[PDB]
Amino acid sequence: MLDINAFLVEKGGDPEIIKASQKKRGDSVELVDEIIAEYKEWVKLRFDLDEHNKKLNSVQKEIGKRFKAKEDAKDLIAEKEKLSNEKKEIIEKEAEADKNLRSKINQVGNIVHESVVDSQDEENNELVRTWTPENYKKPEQIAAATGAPAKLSHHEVLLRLDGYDPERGVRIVGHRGYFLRNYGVFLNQALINYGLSFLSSKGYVPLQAPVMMNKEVMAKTAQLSQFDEELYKVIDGEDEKYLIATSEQPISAYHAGEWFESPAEQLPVRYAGYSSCFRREAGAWGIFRVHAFEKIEQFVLTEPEKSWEEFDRMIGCSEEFYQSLGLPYRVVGIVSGELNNAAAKKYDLEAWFPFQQEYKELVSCSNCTDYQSRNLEIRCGIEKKYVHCLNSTLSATERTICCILENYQKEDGLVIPEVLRKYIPGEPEFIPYIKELPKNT
Amino acid sequence: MLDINAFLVEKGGDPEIIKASQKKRGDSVELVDEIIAEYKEWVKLRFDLDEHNKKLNSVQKEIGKRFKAKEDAKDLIAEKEKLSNEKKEIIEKEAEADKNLRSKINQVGNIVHESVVDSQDEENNELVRTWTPENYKKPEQIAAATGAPAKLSHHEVLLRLDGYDPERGVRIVGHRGYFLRNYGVFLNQALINYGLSFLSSKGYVPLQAPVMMNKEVMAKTAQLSQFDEELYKVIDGEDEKYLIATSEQPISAYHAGEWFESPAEQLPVRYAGYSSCFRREAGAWGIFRVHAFEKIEQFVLTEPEKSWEEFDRMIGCSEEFYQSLGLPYRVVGIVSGELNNAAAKKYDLEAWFPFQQEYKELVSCSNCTDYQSRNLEIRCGIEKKYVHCLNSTLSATERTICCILENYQKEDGLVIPEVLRKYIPGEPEFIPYIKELPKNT
């Protein structure tokens, strides 16, 4: 969340900027005035507590004196007990005010970066750049890597290759359930390992995260909507944890409570996160939108002064990865009304799906500045200064497989993307269709 | 579970053999007599239902006649309604008897194979065979692959290599939580991919299973104790699923309700299962006994006549895998009292851990005959004949890493097992210790 002082003009803050941001987000603007008002009540309580402390200390000294002189102190004792009973009430109120103030601040989104387009409608997303492989004329219903008619959807290609089983998957785990089979498995592993090797060659540290997280830690990195909507809860006898939606969650907390005190030397720290991911929300057929999938994630901590440059570097890394796979794409700047609480700015890389004949999101890249690091107490250098946290998908692997399937299909099977070959037993350049589909021409 | 007819001597069954097996298991012997008694009550109910059907049909014809002749039928109508009211009761009882009978049978373990040692005490496990690499003199406190003093435990080696993070892991997910880091990640992926390639070269079909399963399917393949003890439950709004303990669970159900009608040609079917695994029970330090880990599993369906030969083939496959990693081991035949419900026979491969100076289980191999396939209705050929199901660990990868760490350690770092090198970026032959431990000599 934002610093309490950001709301307080008298403490160098900028509440007007927070109001403008709230408005761009399409979120409550009144919340800002409410926070400021509650802050003043909290301050009044603190003053009142301090005055009671001093009066109490004072009447204590008098009682000591009274007893020393062997004089009755009933009057002072009465005053003491009254001041004491008032102090009790004030302590309770201060605690309540502090709690409610923190809950309110927690509802306010990060300050939307000035570059972001102000709109609630994704039709207004910024077209940042477009890339095509140089031998792919234009995005159309043609497989980019083969020049073949993009005749089959990703689900159909995968079925014909016998690379997954949605029917047995649904029987065993329900909605959108699936097994991967034979080359479906090898392709998924190839993307995971290629992804880890690609990032490690860029100095990222491979990090495989646990897929369960304690509630209290998760709550510090993820917004409310995410719990009562997005995350599966795990029951462990009497205890509960959450399954993660992305390794960004546990990895963001990896350095919680730590301090990069010599940041010129210690930062940036860059992690190639790997984990399975679980989402309660997944809506057609295929492994494009499912409840469980794997992701290689970039997660980076930087000095506050350097996060914007790193943002460009991280999307550049993802772009380079998709270029290496020969997949056409565009990069779009997401409108303000579509940012989650933590993001100050977000670019999506959306790759061309030639059967679908549309660009579909494969990557999101966000600068969350110090919104999470403040909660997680990840300090930077010598109120407090915190690191900036950025996250960017490298590959949601099953979804990336869908894009590969549509772009590498041809009449008799699938061409294997060159960079993935070394990661698959036999280093096949091509794998044939094994099965015909019921519906065909 | 066992066939109902196995309990019925009059139906070609062998209840004495089931009693003997129960006794070997240290489970209830009385359960067998109880099942037989309840079966007879069920039969009595069925007879009574059939007699009521015939009487009812009979009195119906008379009522028709009576009405045809325009005669009063109050007497017949009364008899009809009485027979009807009795039929209602019988139907309800039959359903209850059938339910209780099935619940009882479900409690009876698979018939323990005659080769299995009859005992409740693992000290009596059969020593089946022992293997050592030919340049490793004997199991002692010496790293088998390097000849170096096995000075460090697996946890210490992994710490010195900076290959995992138990401290940040525990903070984020609690008990035994961990991240894998750098080479810890690459080694885990290497074992997964080596394992898949090793089995696929043997004709196994790679199969990556979903890690969630619907309750009703899980209950058909896994015993009661497993739910109220072993499995995490997942909360999905109003619904619930389980996280799997091993890909053997969903893969055993992969062919549920299917029929291998030409088994000479269609069987055996062999799967190289891959998934993460989740266990509520994990007890020191390290990634040897943890709540979440990955496993490559052999899962095989065969004709009933061929399962014993396949059992030998499957343990042979696991042995060959450990031999290829240079890890000394022994194979032990688990005593009757230690078999789970489904296993008719189980071998554990236990690998030598030179720091621990003990053999520790890395592989279990079981022939479950048709105990699960009967529940899952997986038929074989032309009462009913079902396939046999066998399962054997190829590698619990994090645990296998522990064995590698102790056996490949030397004074200045870790030798990378030769077969894994091709799977790790840079194909390192050796990786140096990066960190010193607080406690040392």
- To the nearest whole Å, the CA of B411 is away from the closest chain A CA by 25
3-state secondary structure of A301: strand
How was this structure determined? It was done by: X-ray
Quick check: B185 and A208 CB within 8 A? yes
Interface-testing mutation among A215, A235, A372, with chain B (most B C-beta atoms within 10 A): A235
CATH number at A1-109: 1.10.287.40
Q: How far apart are CA A394 and CA A384, in angstroms?
A: 32
Which DSSP string corresponds to B24-66?
HHT--SHHHHHHHHHHHHHHHHHHHHHHHHHHHHHHHHHHHHH
Whether A415 contacts A408, CB under 8 Å? yes
Which DSSP string corresponds to A20-80?
HHHHHHT--SHHHHHHHHHHHHHHHHHHHHHHHHHHHHHHHHHHHHHHHTT---HHHHHHH
Contacting residues of B for A228, CB less than 8 Å apart: none
Instruction: Report resolution (Å) to 1 decimal.
Output: 2.0
Give the tokens for residue A433: 């269709």
Quick check: A205 and B182 CB within 8 A? yes
Find the closest chain A residue to B227 by CA distance. Answer: A237
Quick check: B250 and A212 CB within 8 A? no
Interface-testing mutation among B176, B192, B208, B247, with chain A (most A C-beta atoms within 10 A): B208
Annotated binding site of B for ATP: 279-281, 290, 361-364
Which residues lie below 8 Å from residue A7, measured CB to CB, with a gap of 6+? A13, A15, A18, A32, A35, A36, A39, A105
Look at phi and psi of residue B322 and say left if phi exceeds 0, alpha if psi is from -120 to 50, else beta.
alpha
The β-bridge relationship of strands A239-243 and B233-236 is unpaired
Which residues of chain B does CATH 1.10.287.40 include?
1-109
Find the closest chain B residue to A219 by CA distance. Answer: B172
Contacting residues of B for A242, CB less than 8 Å apart: none
Which residues of chain B does CATH 3.30.930.10 include?
110-441
Tracing tokens 């046999």 back to the chain, one arrives at B388
> Is A362 part of any known ligand binding site?
yes
Quick check: A214 and B182 CB within 8 A? no
Residue A121, Cα to own-chain centre: how many angstroms?
21
Query: Which CATH class, in words, describes the domain spanning A110-441?
Result: alpha beta
Distance in angstroms between the alpha carbons of the first and the last residue of chain B: 56
What is the dihedral angle through the alpha carbons of A359, A364, A365, A369, rounded to the nearest 10 degrees?
140
Interface-testing mutation among A162, A168, A186, with chain B (most B C-beta atoms within 10 A): A168
Which of A243, A342, A352 shows the shortest CA–CA distance to A299?
A: A342
Annotated binding site of B: 246-248, 279-281, 290, 297, 361-364, 393
Give the tokens for residue A216: 């209290």
Q: How far apart are CA B404 and CA B327, in angstroms?
A: 7
3-state secondary structure of B291: coil
Find the closest chain B residue to A193 by CA distance. Answer: B189
